[PDB]
Design an enzyme around this catalytic site. Sequence first.
Site, PDB file in Angstrom:
ATOM      1  N   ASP A 124       0.662  -6.414  -5.524  1.00  0.00           N
ATOM      2  CA  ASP A 124       0.421  -5.409  -4.497  1.00  0.00           C
ATOM      3  C   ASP A 124       1.688  -4.609  -4.215  1.00  0.00           C
ATOM      4  O   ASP A 124       2.793  -4.999  -4.594  1.00  0.00           O
ATOM      5  CB  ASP A 124      -0.067  -6.095  -3.223  1.00  0.00           C
ATOM      6  CG  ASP A 124      -1.010  -5.237  -2.405  1.00  0.00           C
ATOM      7  OD1 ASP A 124      -1.120  -4.014  -2.652  1.00  0.00           O
ATOM      8  OD2 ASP A 124      -1.647  -5.808  -1.502  1.00  0.00           O
ATOM      9  N   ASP A 168      -8.906   0.912  -1.328  1.00  0.00           N
ATOM     10  CA  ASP A 168      -9.674  -0.329  -1.323  1.00  0.00           C
ATOM     11  C   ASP A 168     -11.156  -0.058  -1.109  1.00  0.00           C
ATOM     12  O   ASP A 168     -11.540   0.713  -0.228  1.00  0.00           O
ATOM     13  CB  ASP A 168      -9.195  -1.265  -0.212  1.00  0.00           C
ATOM     14  CG  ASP A 168      -7.772  -1.762  -0.415  1.00  0.00           C
ATOM     15  OD1 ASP A 168      -7.228  -1.652  -1.536  1.00  0.00           O
ATOM     16  OD2 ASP A 168      -7.216  -2.293   0.562  1.00  0.00           O
TER      17      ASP A 168
END
Lengths: 390, 392
Positions: free
Chosen positions: A139, A200
């Site tokens: 990430d 997302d």
Amino acid sequence: LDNGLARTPTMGWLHWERFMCNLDCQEEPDSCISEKLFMEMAELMVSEGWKDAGYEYLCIDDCWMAPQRDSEGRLQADPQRFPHGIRQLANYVHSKGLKLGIYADVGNKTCAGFPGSFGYYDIDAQTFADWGVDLLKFDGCYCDSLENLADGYKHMSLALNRTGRSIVYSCEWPLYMWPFQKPNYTEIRQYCNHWRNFADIDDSWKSIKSILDWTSFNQERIVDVAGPGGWNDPDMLVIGNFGLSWNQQVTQMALWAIMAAPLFMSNDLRHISPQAKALLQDKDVIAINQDPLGKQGYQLRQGDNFEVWERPLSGLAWAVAMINRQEIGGPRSYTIAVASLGKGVACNPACFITQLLPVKRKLGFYEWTSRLRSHINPTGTVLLQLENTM
Amino acid sequence: LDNGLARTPTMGWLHWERFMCNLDCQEEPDSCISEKLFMEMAELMVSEGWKDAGYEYLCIDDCWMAPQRDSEGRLQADPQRFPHGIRQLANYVHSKGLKLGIYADVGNKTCAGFPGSFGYYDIDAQTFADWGVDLLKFDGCYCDSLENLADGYKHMSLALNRTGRSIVYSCEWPLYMWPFQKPNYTEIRQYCNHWRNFADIDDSWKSIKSILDWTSFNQERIVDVAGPGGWNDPDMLVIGNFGLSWNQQVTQMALWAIMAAPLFMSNDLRHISPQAKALLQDKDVIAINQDPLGKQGYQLRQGDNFEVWERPLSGLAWAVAMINRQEIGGPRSYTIAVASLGKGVACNPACFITQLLPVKRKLGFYEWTSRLRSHINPTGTVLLQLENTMQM
Ligand SMILES: *[C@@H]1O[C@H](CO)[C@@H](O[C@@H]2O[C@H](CO)[C@@H](O[C@@H]3O[C@H](CO)[C@@H](O)[C@H](O[C@H]4O[C@H](CO)[C@@H](O)[C@H](O)[C@@H]4O)[C@@H]3O)[C@H](O)[C@H]2NC(C)=O)[C@H](O)[C@H]1NC(C)=O
Ligand SMILES: *[C@@H]1O[C@H](CO)[C@@H](O[C@@H]2O[C@H](CO)[C@@H](O[C@@H]3O[C@H](CO)[C@@H](O)[C@H](O[C@H]4O[C@H](CO)[C@@H](O)[C@H](O)[C@@H]4O)[C@@H]3O)[C@H](O)[C@H]2NC(C)=O)[C@H](O)[C@H]1NC(C)=O
Ligand SMILES: *[C@@H]1O[C@H](CO)[C@@H](O[C@@H]2O[C@H](CO)[C@@H](O)[C@H](O)[C@H]2NC(C)=O)[C@H](O)[C@H]1NC(C)=O
Ligand SMILES: *[C@@H]1O[C@H](CO)[C@@H](O[C@@H]2O[C@H](CO)[C@@H](O)[C@H](O)[C@H]2NC(C)=O)[C@H](O)[C@H]1NC(C)=O
Ligand SMILES: *[C@@H]1O[C@H](CO)[C@@H](O)[C@H](O)[C@H]1NC(C)=O
Ligand SMILES: *[C@@H]1O[C@H](CO)[C@@H](O)[C@H](O)[C@H]1NC(C)=O
Ligand SMILES: CN1[C@H](CO)[C@H](O)[C@H](O)[C@H]1CN
Ligand SMILES: CN1[C@H](CO)[C@H](O)[C@H](O)[C@H]1CN
């Protein structure tokens, strides 16, 4: 990434969308991020046919870490929620014939605030390899510079390589770069097995539409770079959850096959409808997603609230998806000359067409002069496979 | 409207959302607006249990008309798509034990461009009565003034009355006033059995959320106006179509029960899942919608991506709906003191609580001091019925 992995899009399960960062094991013991959750998912991946269908990587996302590193500066799993540690969990997952994915962050902290890997890239890579990790999702939160972002992603790629263990490397590098600078996908592909491009996903049709629209908008930049070893990642499958109608679930499955997307389910395998399971385990559609040629599909046409996508497959075959984006009324008729499909070769001189979604039905032989007519449900997709008569 | 009708919210089927204005019977015969579509839909309303559940009005929306009136200045159905005429269709529908709704427009044309009723209100009303029409939906396109809008709606109300036939009167008056001026709901209720307040629904969760959010935002203006004879209309049920997940279908059914909404399905009864059918035919939820007290429910609380709505029912009972508006993750826990529900009356001194949606399950006896805990699916609703009791 030329590590011999992800020669087809990675398939598995990832906890983030459905289970998020639930740390309340006292009040929500069956839904908190714990080793018990992942053990139950591995058990069901074996017993309910997921592994046989190809879903192989059981993946931990954010919120598995203890709040601090060990004495030697190594990451540790939370002692209460992962009491036996990641290496033991990996042993169990491997004993099931499955592979284990884990999560880390390129910056100073994970997006949820747990220890980042900046300053520990080699330590963290060697730790993951020692644990038996088979996949790393990396990430991009808490990274102060574009140079640190790029350098971190490349350094972690190299450190993983140096461990000598085969570890699928999943990167969010493009997503975190895009607001500031256009990514160079040649470089990203050089370092990553697949890469997140867009925001997302959540449990909504709106999210599906946004992902598809951004993919088609950027298709000239990203479609040709994808192939064996390196895939575009449009984020998790959310089939089996709460926000998608049946036709919207069909659309996600069909288009993730067209896009040669990694197929990471994020759902509860303990509570999933038979229809959702049959769609997610659809052998013909998975075979399209997993086509060994590994050429990503693309949007061929859009207009009149319809979209036509297509994907070249091995052995002169093509997959074609037709989406009805009109969110009112009933099934709408769409007609297209088959000579317009597959760059004019799919059906020259003829092709046999099989509908796969929403239901499997042989449509018959179509000559190069023919026109294909279908009725497509609102927010649904018709997925077809075309076989040239040779 | 004091015509003795709509003492409970009207229930039936209306073609508009699912079938719209499809006139292409050559290429889309199963979707075009035709007398055969309505005849088959009436057959299924009988044979598949819809009539038994309470859905009684089979309603035609726009695009049934011929392009012009006849020589006698009377409306006519399209000769190609309705060759046997509205009177025979009404005879067929009545022979099935059902009632027939039709569509007209207050202005010079219908919204799709067919003959309007301006200048023909009394002729058109008597025509509908002669045909055996039992309900009129009255649209608001092509009206040059608000004064003409109001006068036309009131005039058509009176003309329908003058026929002597009982005809449910469904008005779009408030919706067409909104761009210019806030509606006077006392007047509208005086003339209409129910009235559309907000934009047309479509086959999407976005549309459901928009209707709910507009209703709750405006609830102080519209909730108390509703009651027997006059209801707020938040538009058709779209359960059984394509765009709503199961939990979103549950949300629409539960909240239309809470809102004392007319229940006009707009779907294809020839192609409907068993789950959608069982939800739409849910006797307990329909009983909430059809509660004889006829007091519309309201939003009690909103926060943390949760909503709590409630509706007072006959005999000290209440319906309570909890919506999870977080569109990510899993079922979320919500806890509330039962003393906060039903104005403190529902569970004084105790209440028996029955969950009705998404599944039916008796939860037990709750004392006035107790707390109710539930888990609600993303975009779903938990619907409960609370029955006041002294037993325990
Ligand atoms: C660390 O990085 C290095 C360099 O990037 C990487 O080495 C590379 O490994 C891949 C896969 O192991 C090699 O690709 C193979 O090359 C050999 C050449 O002898 C081929 O025989 C292989 O063919 C495979 O696929 C065939 C079909 O295409 C099949 O017949 C069969 O399945 C074969 O297995 C494959 O193309 C690549 O050549 C090397 N590159 C270098 C420079 O060494 C290494 O894997 C990385 N290590 C880790 C732990 O990540
Ligand atoms: C044309 O308009 C007139 C008025 O503009 C309308 O008549 C009105 O409505 C109803 C007609 O059914 C009348 O209401 C009844 O009044 C008597 C008075 O004793 C009551 O007993 C009746 O009560 C029964 O029905 C009610 C349901 O509406 C229940 O609430 C009740 O419990 C009983 O079951 C009922 O209230 C009303 O008095 C007249 N008003 C007048 C005439 O001024 C007429 O029906 C319209 N015609 C058409 C064809 O629409
Ligand atoms: C994107 O990155 C790639 C790889 O980092 C660049 O391609 C390399 O370019 C150098 C010269 O700068 C060559 O020596 C290499 O052979 C190239 N590698 C490959 C695999 O082709 C590319 O130039 C970059 N593009 C942009 C626009 O910056
Ligand atoms: C239907 O159209 C007619 C004709 O345009 C409208 O009648 C006009 O009304 C306006 C104001 O409302 C006057 O200025 C004109 O003098 C009228 N013309 C005629 C020929 O009468 C009528 O109002 C329209 N009806 C509606 C409901 O809008
Ligand atoms: C982490 O924090 C230190 C100190 O604030 C900073 O120098 C470094 O650049 C940060 N790393 C990243 C990747 O932002
Ligand atoms: C609304 O209309 C009714 C009936 O004409 C009237 O009694 C009432 O005063 C009106 N309200 C307002 C605010 O104009
Ligand atoms: C915010 N993080 C989350 C972990 O905290 C998920 O991994 C998501 O994919 C990423 C943002 N793109
Ligand atoms: C546009 N008309 C349509 C008929 O054409 C539907 O009746 C809808 O309810 C109304 C707009 N509110």
